[PDB]
């Protein structure tokens, strides 16, 4: 309300020092100043890695309840974590993702040197936005928005299962309030 320069997202906080706006998805939202303590490139790579993992996590949390493979067994994903820990396949997932992150770490260390864009592994086999440059930043904005939405969504689904003990598809069709609150007294 009072005159002064502030961030586009939060109107009572100023624009952060290291959020100039060159990176996609930047609405000037850094209240605690994480970009002032650590580099924006490392933070962007961490954000993209978390967001992509969360995208695949939300897709899995939907599909595993929607359709389970003929092998393994029909079980909810959260205890399926323990089931596949005891089965041995999750250790192999860990090994292969570690093998990918071995090269990912070298990519990150070259990102600090400023030789590659943060989160840019140059993986476009379908050339969906490789030849065209105007589509590239639009797809980057879409990817980062989907990344944040997927992180929020996976956290929501997990914490809904933790108190509801129902599947995500089960909860949107058999919606029950927690703790027996429909007919609860002195809660």
């Amino acid at each position: 309300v009072f005159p002064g320069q502030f961030s586009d997202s939060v109107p009572f906080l100023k624009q952060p020092t290291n959020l100039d706006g060159s990176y996609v998805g930047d609405v000037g939202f850094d209240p605690l100043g994480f970009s002032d303590v650590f580099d924006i490139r490392v933070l962007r790579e961490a954000e993209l890695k978390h967001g992509r993992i969360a995208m695949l996590a939300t897709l899995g949390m939907v599909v595993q309840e929607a359709y389970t493979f003929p092998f393994f067994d029909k079980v909810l994903p959260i205890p399926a974590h323990d089931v596949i820990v005891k089965s041995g396949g999750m250790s192999q997932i860990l090994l292969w993702t570690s093998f990918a992150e071995i090269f990912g770490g070298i990519a990150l260390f070259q990102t600090i040197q400023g030789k590659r864009a943060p989160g840019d592994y140059s993986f476009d086999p379908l050339n969906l936005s490789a030849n065209d440059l105007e589509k590239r930043e639009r797809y980057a904005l879409a990817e980062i928005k989907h990344s944040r939405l997927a992180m929020l969504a996976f956290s929501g689904m997990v914490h809904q299962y933790f108190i509801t003990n129902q599947g995500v598809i089960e909860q949107i069709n058999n919606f029950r309030p927690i703790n027996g609150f429909p007919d609860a007294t002195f809660s």
């Binding site: 090269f103 070298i106 990519a107 070259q110 590659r116 840019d120 140059s122 993986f123």
Partner: protein, 173 residues
């Protein structure tokens, strides 16, 4: 370039066969590239003969020895004596072919080609373009055969079945 999101390694110019700039962990630096090339060729050749040995030992057994359940267990059913004869014969071959130079320091004293032990009895490697093509073929086949050997040894250890026997009798663990 094999790894597009990383730079080309500084020591991989492309002189050797099969060089596509694949060294993210950077063993090309801080080491001798000739040593690594000879090690790669030696591992490739050893696994390249080992895959054929694993294929042969399923159906063909020498009359002196008794065949085991797997070619992996063929190592145990043969006596301990005779095994060390193979060990010492390989030692003698690797001593005479390398010119009795066996360390990263004294090897490549004459700056010979890495992996070139002077063993061309049939004289196939005469045309230099064909020589380069056969270098590429040998290196890529070794890179395939080392992975193949590492796979088939563990498959025979885990399933207690031969590789062709496993492919004809595929089953879960």
């Amino acid at each position: 370039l094999a790894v597009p999101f990383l730079e080309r390694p500084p020591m991989l110019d492309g002189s050797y066969a099969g060089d596509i700039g694949f060294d993210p962990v950077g063993f090309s630096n801080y080491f001798d590239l000739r040593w690594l090339r000879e090690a790669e060729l030696k591992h490739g050749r050893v696994c390249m003969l080992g895959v054929v040995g694993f294929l042969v030992q399923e159906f063909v057994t020498l009359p002196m020895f008794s065949n085991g359940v797997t070619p992996v267990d063929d190592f145990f059913v043969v006596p301990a004596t005779g095994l060390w004869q193979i060990f010492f014969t390989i030692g003698f071959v690797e001593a005479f072919s390398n010119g009795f130079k066996l360390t990263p320091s004294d090897m490549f004293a004459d700056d010979r080609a890495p992996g070139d032990l002077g063993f061309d009895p049939l004289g196939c490697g005469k045309d230099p373009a064909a020589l380069a093509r056969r270098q590429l073929v040998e290196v890529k086949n070794g890179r395939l055969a080392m992975i193949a050997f590492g796979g088939m040894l563990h498959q025979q250890l885990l399933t207690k079945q031969g590789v062709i026997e496993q492919l004809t009798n595929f089953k879960a663990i």
